[PDB]
């Protein structure tokens, strides 16, 4: 299975990056080719500022022990006003670019990321204009003209149809930027009720994703609209979402959602049985629904007389009993059940 | 994958059973072809008695709504003394058999299960004699002679080498009994320290099982010593074990070990992403180590520029970050990691 450097990408050295929103203390430079400080903002006058500069200086200091680390500033983010005005004229565009190059020289940044969410749309509550889409290309042109070719320029966007037709000229911005930071998450950020309880970052389509929205379709949409594959960065959320309403950090799922009293679920795929670890060590051996499906398979493939448990009294809700009975009597039904529980490669 | 009634077993109608130790209230007759009441015991005089008859009468009453349910009594169990004496002479053997047939007529049982643990061995603290092994066959012969062919007779045993050579004449008892109840569990019941922290019921061998002990090797050992496959019942534990010291009921793992605040882990194998359910409903969408391995695969197979997360601040321990960095830089190492976590069919 595992692909190590595809034999048609001898050139293409794919990079790892994180957006760093807030205190950067727990960033590990050793894992990352690049860090993207979030965020710089635009004030009433169209002037760039950093709300929390100490975080950016702290993050810049990681170049002490890893001088090859790339430090980028992202301007904007959801609800961040100013871009439609900045993009509108040759003057606003020259002024914005000049301030980008000033912030790059001032902080010795490796370059800049633009997070307009989104040109042509007032979904986030910001100003939009029909001309935003063509204007975006001229803004990026104005930034690239000033900062030069030797600095990172990137754009955060989606791969959905609306974005390709109404927000950006993918084929025009492609040769200007170094990367398109595909925000392949938050698929359910605008949904409540039934359509809220779907996947936010499904890699492919299924029953539990929004019709249309999938990572793969966003990568293909961007590729066919003229974005080279090598310039696409695939975005992964380190949070959980359930519709527009609720989000949780991985840290908050790690504490209130997944691992019971620190006991971690493990599987021996040789042995074909589940087990538990806690504090490095092997901690429990039992049978669950999968190892009972596999044992009941063995019964049927090997012409055995049947199966039995020790003992009903240990399984008062008849959860294992059901699995064991279905395993023998209707193994198709139990396989369907476990297709919706056990992660396959 | 899923086998439904192997095309070389048109005859062989494989059965589901449970041992019922203690209060039988939560037995579901609808799941089971047979229930095995545990236990009857042998007193100082060699006389059969039931320590808790009300449980057996309660269990017998399940034949009201399911008259085809088979109700069996198991005599013995771990540490249960008397069998070596009962097996020793033509008199003890006739006397034991007579009392078995009496208990079968008295309770209208469908038959009997013999749980001598184990002939020829004093491991459990019981009496053994070298002659136990040949004597076992004559005891079973004496029971079958009295109860007739129309009653269930079964023997609880293991498939290990010691049991085949020193406890039972598999080829001699085979034609006497209806079933051999393979106790394919407790592999670690006699181990502490390093060799304690292995699997108790591994279906095949691995790094985490005792050298020798596996369900498959016990089924093959019994088959090659002359036990027909159709008479073997495969035993599954509804408890967890860690060496000789600690055991937990499935109910006790369900409460103190596996499902955090009732939140259940589910996987969309189409979508290729994890999610959580609670109270019927879809409850959380996120990315874990598997969906990050799969996303980083997509990056490498599809010649993308790299990957990025939103945001390091949500993953303060760098657990997702590591997975994402290894996913791109050493995908072999991360696959090995997940082979020891994710249950494959």
Author numbering:
A (entry chain AAA), B (entry chain AAA): 368 to 712
Source paper text:
To obtain unliganded CotE(349–712), the first Ni–NTA column-chromatography purification procedure was modified so that after the binding and washing steps, the column was washed with buffer C (buffer A containing 2 M guanidine hydrochloride) to partially unfold the immobilized protein and allow the dissociation of endogenous ligand(s). The partially unfolded/refolded protein was crystallized in a different crystal form (P6122). Solution of the structure and refinement against data extending to ∼2.1 Å resolution revealed that the substrate-binding groove was indeed empty. However, the structure proved to be of a 3D domain-swapped dimer. In this structure, domain exchange takes place at residue Lys627. Thus, 244 Cα atoms in the residue range 368–623 can be superposed with an r.m.s.d. of 0.44 Å, while similarly 78 Cα atoms of residues 627–708 can be superposed with an r.m.s.d. of 0.43 Å. In almost all instances 3D domain swapping is a crystallographic artefact and there is no evidence that the 3D domain-swapped dimer of CotE(349–712) is physiologically significant. It is nevertheless structurally interesting since it involves (i) the exchange of a strand, β8, from the β-barrel and (ii) the breakage of the intramolecular disulfide bond between Cys376 and Cys670 and the formation of an intermolecular equivalent. The 3D domain-swapped CotE(349–712) structure reported here is therefore the second example, with the distinction that it is the C-terminal strand 8 of the barrel that is swapped.
Among the most interesting of the discovered proteins was CotE, an 81 kDa protein comprising an N-terminal domain homologous to 1-Cys peroxiredoxins, a central cysteine-rich interdomain region and a C-terminal domain with homology to family 18 glycosyl hydrolases (GH18). CotE is a bifunctional spore-coat protein with peroxiredoxin and chitinase domains that are implicated in colonization. Insertional mutagenesis showed that cotE is not essential for spore integrity; however, in animal models of CDI, when CotE is absent the capacity of spores to colonize the intestine and induce virulence is markedly reduced.
